[PDB]
From Swiss-Prot:
Tissue: Secreted in the A cells of the islets of Langerhans.
Protein's name according to its UniProt entry: Glucagon
Species: Homo sapiens
Induction pattern: Release is stimulated by hypoglycemia and inhibited by hyperglycemia, insulin, and somatostatin.
Gene expressing this chain: GCG
Function description: Plays a key role in glucose metabolism and homeostasis. Regulates blood glucose by increasing gluconeogenesis and decreasing glycolysis. A counterregulatory hormone of insulin, raises plasma glucose levels in response to insulin-induced hypoglycemia. Plays an important role in initiating and maintaining hyperglycemic conditions in diabetes.
Amino acid sequence: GTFTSDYSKYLDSRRAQDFVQWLMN
């Protein structure tokens, strides 16, 4: 559980990047 918050933030950034690319195409 040591890396979960740090990873959750990275996953957040990825899902937002996925959203943005979808919105641009």
